[PDB]
Amino acid sequence: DIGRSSVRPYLEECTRRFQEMFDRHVVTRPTKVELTDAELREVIDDCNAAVAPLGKTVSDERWISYVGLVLWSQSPRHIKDMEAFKAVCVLNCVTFVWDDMDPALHDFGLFLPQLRKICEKYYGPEDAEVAYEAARAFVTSDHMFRDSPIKAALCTTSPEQYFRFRVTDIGVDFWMKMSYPIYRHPEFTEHAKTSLAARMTTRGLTIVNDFYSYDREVSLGQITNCFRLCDVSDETAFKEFFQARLDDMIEDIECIKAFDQLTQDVFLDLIYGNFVWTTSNKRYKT
Amino acid sequence: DIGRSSVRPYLEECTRRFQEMFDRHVVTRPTKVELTDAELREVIDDCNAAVAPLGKTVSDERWISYVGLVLWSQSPRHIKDMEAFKAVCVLNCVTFVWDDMDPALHDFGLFLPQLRKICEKYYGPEDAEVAYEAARAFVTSDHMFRDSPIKAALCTTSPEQYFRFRVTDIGVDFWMKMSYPIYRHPEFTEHAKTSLAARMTTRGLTIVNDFYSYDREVSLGQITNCFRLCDVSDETAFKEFFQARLDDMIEDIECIKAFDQLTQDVFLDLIYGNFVWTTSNKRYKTA
Ligand SMILES: [Cl-]
Ligand SMILES: [Mg+2]
Ligand SMILES: [Mg+2]
Ligand SMILES: [Mg+2]
Ligand SMILES: [Mg+2]
Ligand SMILES: [Mg+2]
Ligand SMILES: [Mg+2]
Ligand SMILES: [Mg+2]
């Protein structure tokens, strides 16, 4: 169905409605962390060093585009450890590269030691092991589920099964487990380590990403996108599905407000910051 | 509200319908691991040593009742490492004790080193770290959420929020992360480590546990039970809610059958075994 090849007809209204929802339920805007020139050079140098064994040359412009996710979606008022912050910048960037690679070019023997080097550089020993395991689990999951029947079943059955897959696959469990050292906040550290932090934020991250990455993904034959569960060529069907997804986001956001003040700031800054970054990034345009 | 204080009016019919569902959708019955008298004594001795610093005496009969969960809900055809199996017996048992304790008697300084000792006895070094971290995160979660407003929000809002809390709180993530060394199966190891294994099995474990532990939990003022989300004193409301939960179990089970054969056996033996153990255990027969 060529009518289902694009969500472009809904682009402007959906963007407006996402923003309206955030203004009504989160209110406080995300803020962009600013890196010094020295910090941004350090981050890019580490990204280039990590993907060089895989034969990939990545421009500064591409790295800076991927790093904007971290700059916009962390919680600047609560940052305590800028070394952990740089680590998340590097790890976020290089796993975008992995996510985009053909699996024939994936090489664990070459890439996993680079992830370990990044973690050992920026984290103390215990946190380094936690961040590295989460990175390893994510890149392994991305690899093993390429064209997988498990992925097919979880992504075609219901929203419940799909979001369950995405807790790992969209990277948010990884994100929380490498981000808690930024904040040094005992409650958030526990929610990161139980993955409750990831489970609370999966839908709000995923629904936004899926909307803006739909056209690209379906053009590439990728099935990991919740809007494939609906007939996007039927305007009534799309409207009902989109509203059900907005309701999921709102329910999660209202439950996130029961968490402690710092933790809920981190969770909400992540979901809203991802939206601000997604709508500004050429990755998601045509 | 006394009419909501019990699910006893539904006990026989719900038990029958759970079993019918398993016979239709899982088919293969769970089977019970048998421990030698020496193995069982080694497990119970480790349990006693681990909880002794907390001042608790626990009878053998009581340890045996908790260890039946592991004997019934692992996957005997796939067991390769019986030391890992004994570790799960011990860790399962002692965290029931933690789950039943008044939190004023929780002592992390005394208990966490005992959990570390168990993991170091039975697993290799990498696996021991994974099992200990999962056990530590579980007992920390149980403690910090006692009477917590986060718990109140997640357990009163919707089934979605509730089962999200239970991925950790029922202990299944912990179970998976201490059980993958039993099987030495690379795919299952990865689903355990991503917690996809736990997310796939949470509803089937939790709906069954919640039904049979409702009366006890309500009598103690505990709110972590999905049947509190429905008016159990209304037979029509209870029937609709129960059917919705059966449908959730079936959807999970049918999706589980897309995993590799060994992994799906482990997942399904866990869900069905938990039901067989729950319906035969005195823990769930009096409040
Ligand atoms: Cl670990
Ligand atoms: Mg991906
Ligand atoms: Mg992608
Ligand atoms: Mg996407
Ligand atoms: Mg409990
Ligand atoms: Mg309990
Ligand atoms: Mg219970
Ligand atoms: Mg009534």
Swiss-Prot record, chain B:
The EC number(s) attached to this protein equal 4.2.3.146
Q: Which InterPro entries match?
A: Isoprenoid_synthase_dom_sf
Q: Which reaction does it catalyse?
A: geranylgeranyl diphosphate + H2O = cyclooctat-9-en-7-ol + diphosphate
Q: How does it assemble?
A: Homodimer.
Natural source organism: Streptomyces melanosporofaciens
Renumbered to this chain, motif NSE/DTE motif spans 209-217
Is Chloroplast there in the keyword field? Answer: no
Q: What is the effect of changing residue 100 to E?
A: Abolishes activity, no product
Q: For Mg(2+) 3, which residues are the binding ones? A: 209, 213, 217
Q: Where do transmembrane segments lie in this chain?
A: none
Binding residues annotated for Mg(2+) 2, in chain numbering: 99
- Give the family from UniProt: Belongs to the terpene synthase family.
State the source organism's domain of life: Bacteria
Identify which top EC class this enzyme belongs to: lyase
Alphabetical keyword list: Isomerase, Lyase, Magnesium, Metal-binding
Q: Motif span (DDXXD motif)?
A: 99-102
Q: What does this protein do?
A: Catalyzes the cyclization of the linear isoprenoid intermediate geranylgeranyl diphosphate to tricycclic cyclooctat-9-en-7-ol in the cyclooctatin biosynthesis pathway. Cyclooctatin is a potent inhibitor of lysophospholipase.
Q: What is known of its domains?
A: The Asp-Asp-Xaa-Xaa-Asp/Glu(DDXXD/E) motifs is important for the catalytic activity, presumably through binding to Mg(2+).
Mind listing the GO molecular function terms for this protein? isomerase activity; lyase activity; metal ion binding
Q: Where does Mg(2+) 1 bind?
A: 99
The record's misc note reads: 3,7,18-dolabellatriene produced by the Trp288Gly mutant has potential antibiotic activity against multidrug-resistant S.aureus (MRSA).
State what protein this is by name.
Answer: Cyclooctat-9-en-7-ol synthase
In this record, what's one Pfam family?
Terpene_syn_C_2
Cofactors:
Mg(2+)
What effect on the protein does mutating residue 102 to E have, as reported in its record? No change in product (cyclooctat-9-en-7-ol)
Altering residue 138 to G/H/L/V: what's the impact?
A: Produces cyclooctat-9-en-7-ol
The note on the cofactor says: Binds 3 Mg(2+) ions per subunit.
